[PDB]
Amino acid sequence: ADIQTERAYQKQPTIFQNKKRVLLGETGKEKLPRYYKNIGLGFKTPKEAIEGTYIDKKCPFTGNVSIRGRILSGVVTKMKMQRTIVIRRDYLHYIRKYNRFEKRHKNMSVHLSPCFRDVQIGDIVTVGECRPLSKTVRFNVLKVTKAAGTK
Amino acid sequence: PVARSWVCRKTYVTPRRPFEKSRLDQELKLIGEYGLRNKREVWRVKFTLAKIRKAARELLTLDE
């Protein structure tokens, strides 16, 4: 749709879009050059990030963030905030006194870039650590894989 | 902070059963034959021998 939905002009900061040119180049196509980067560690840039038009300064591929630290996994539980979701990580904690285990879980709020679409509740997400993006958000979504049962 | 040492240990233990005729007779025989001063001198040597024999038993619990 339209990317200008805020009171300020939404723009990708490193791209200059007011270059004047001959009318021959103007007649052809008004396609802005996109900025994107390779985040490393074998993660591949999604196609829609390169071909898209969304503006997200917190996107790991088209924004100004750096991925460094821990790489984790989780299951998507809630998608109700703007560009950020809540995932859950389950584990077993061992008690030595009784020589047994107990089930525990942790909840994480992670930033979801608009490049990832058709993400549902219950699929596996691989996230990486970045700088604090808000009060509680410190991880940013790197890869999405669908639930095994649901096709 | 000081430049002193706090490392110390006791060298004997008082007997577990205080009224045993056999224990008293053994102490009397040892003190009389070796001219010792009191019971503490016997208990010190008993403590040393107990440590040595406990170490030997613990070593014997292992493979050759």
């Binding site: 200008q4 009171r7 002009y9 509680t136 | -």
Partner: protein, 180 residues
Amino acid sequence: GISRDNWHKRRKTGGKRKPYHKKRKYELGRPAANTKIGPRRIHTVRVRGGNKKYRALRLDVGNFSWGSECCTRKTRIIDVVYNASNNELVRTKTLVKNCIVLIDSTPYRQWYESHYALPLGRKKERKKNAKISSLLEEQFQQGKLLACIASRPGQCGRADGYVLEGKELEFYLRKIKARK
């Protein structure tokens, strides 16, 4: 006084926490620079580590860049027209980053006339290309250009920016018109 710490805030779950220490020096905050338009008045602030910040209280000029023509000129500032954060800053004429201002067009017109040898703003190997958008021509007729401030006056002590052009200019013109 002013503190920008985290431990006065509630937890993520919603529960509140009790402090275990008093306020620290490295958590301080300082009153804002409500930079107005007028004769130049700038104060210096000694900051952590022994460095300096230029706290501009009042400014009237800045150098702005005509990006399409690559012409950077120092020009006076006339008025504040639009502010995305709050409309009160427009009413009180406060200079902050990313606010839209009106600047004089005289040095840009002078450079254009001395460069291309064509008239502009007047009432009724490759050659140089002299083409101007109709919106920019109308603004040059009015004598005032719409510009955007890119620096932080309360931190660096100067108000720099660039002349609005293209789709950004159309967006901000539509916003200004809809505000009225």
